[PDB]
Swiss-Prot record:
Substitution effect: residue 111 to A: Abolishes transfer of phosphoethanolamine (PEA) to a lipid A analog in vitro. Almost abolishes resistance of E.coli strain Rosetta to polymyxin B, by comparison with the same strain expressing wild-type mcr-1
EC number(s) per entry: 2.7.8.43
Residues that bear Phosphothreonine: 67
PTM remark: Phosphorylated at Thr-67; may represent an intermediate in the catalytic mechanism.
Subunit-level organization: Monomer.
Compartment(s): Cell inner membrane
Known role: Probably catalyzes the addition of a phosphoethanolamine moiety to lipid A. Phosphoethanolamine modification of lipid A confers polymyxin resistance. Confers resistance to polymyxin-type antibiotics such as colistin; in the E.coli strain W3110.
Descriptive protein name: Phosphatidylethanolamine transferase Mcr-1
One Gene Ontology CC term in the entry: plasma membrane
GO process terms (BP): lipopolysaccharide core region biosynthetic process; response to antibiotic
Range of the intact protein held here: 219 to 541 of 541
Listed GO MF terms: phosphotransferase activity, phosphate group as acceptor
Positions with a binding annotation for Zn(2+): 28, 67, 247-248
Length: 323
């Protein structure tokens, strides 16, 4: 494995200050321009809007347009202009660094898998939440599809087993994954009707396609809010923060393009303009950058290092989501 941060050091330890507990929601297929906070005409994030201390970032560009390309890039040290999807899984990434420095790393996945990111770490630190063998929240819809909120169940058991350590929990969302947006949310989120079903996206009425997409964002709004609420139940003993970034956006019929994964060279705006949210408890001393900072997926790795008081020369100058 090719290293990049063997110099990384943790400036303060959880035995000499409050331990730190962070949830990083790795979002899926969410577009920046369908976020209420970014000027969308629909209130797609009602529950997040009621939580104080949430920063919305209005100018975030993803590293790529697919899950397989963007997810490794989000945890990489190389940045988007130097990232190589084909050698990514042999590079030291930010989670390798934090685990080495003693931060407890957990990856729960309701999407696919970590696309190589967790591969160097013990397998017990990755959990498949697409199956009812782990996910207790699957029988809430006619499809029996397991839901992102199920990834929150039993996180206290993980906290208990890591009592007093710093902890970083990745929750990899099913989110807005298509083509079957109508399957991605339970009935209580079916606010926008009528809804496109079936996989022939270009054949649906355009408004019905958007309606299904926006309904899935409502379910993601709920999941993120529930994630912050769960963190709040540990705010006494832990410095708690939540970072959300989507892996890429989605085309919804613009110029006849649907889904995503188009090469960066011809990729439409809509596939790379992603939402990002950051929440932290006022106790932590973490300060967000301005909501309108020009940001990319390159900001993720310095953000996670700063959240755990880790410095690494490779990303010393890099802009993060936080100061």
């Amino acid at each position: 494995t090719i290293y990049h941060a063997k110099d990384a050091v943790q400036a303060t330890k959880p035995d000499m200050r409050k331990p730190r507990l962070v949830v990083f929601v790795v979002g899926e297929t969410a577009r920046a321009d369908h976020v209420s906070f970014n000027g969308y005409e629909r209130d797609t994030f009602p529950q997040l809007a009621k939580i104080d201390g949430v920063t919305n970032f209005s100018n975030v560009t993803s590293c790529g347009t697919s899950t397989a390309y963007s997810v490794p890039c989000m945890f990489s040290y190389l940045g988007a202009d130097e990232y190589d999807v084909d050698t990514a899984k042999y590079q030291e990434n930010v989670l390798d660094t934090l685990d080495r420095l003693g931060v407890s790393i957990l990856w729960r996945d309701n999407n696919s898998d970590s696309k190589g990111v967790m591969d160097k770490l013990p397998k017990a630190q990755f959990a498949d939440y697409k199956s009812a063998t782990n996910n207790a929240i699957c029988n809430t819809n006619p499809y029996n599809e397991c839901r992102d909120v199920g990834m929150l169940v039993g996180l206290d058991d993980f906290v208990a087993a890591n009592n007093g350590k710093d902890m970083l929990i990745m929750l990899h969302q099913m989110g807005n994954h298509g083509p079957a947006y109508f399957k991605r949310y339970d009935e209580k989120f079916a606010k926008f009707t009528p809804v496109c079903e079936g996989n022939e996206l270009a054949k649906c009425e355009h408004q019905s396609l958007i309606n299904a997409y926006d309904n899935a964002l409502l379910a993601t709004d709920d999941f993120i809010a529930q994630s912050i609420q769960w963190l709040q139940t540990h705010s006494n003993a832990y410095d708690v923060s939540m970072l959300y970034v989507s892996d890429h956006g989605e085309s919804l019929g613009e110029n006849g393009v649907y889904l995503h994964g188009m090469p960066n060279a011809f990729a439409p705006k809509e596939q790379r303009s992603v939402p990002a949210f950051f929440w932290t408890d006022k106790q932590t001393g973490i300060t967000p950058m301005a909501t309108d900072t020009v940001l990319t997926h390159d900001a993720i790795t310095p953000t996670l290092l700063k959240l755990f008081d880790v410095t690494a020369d490779k990303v010393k100058d890099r802009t993060a989501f936080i100061r």
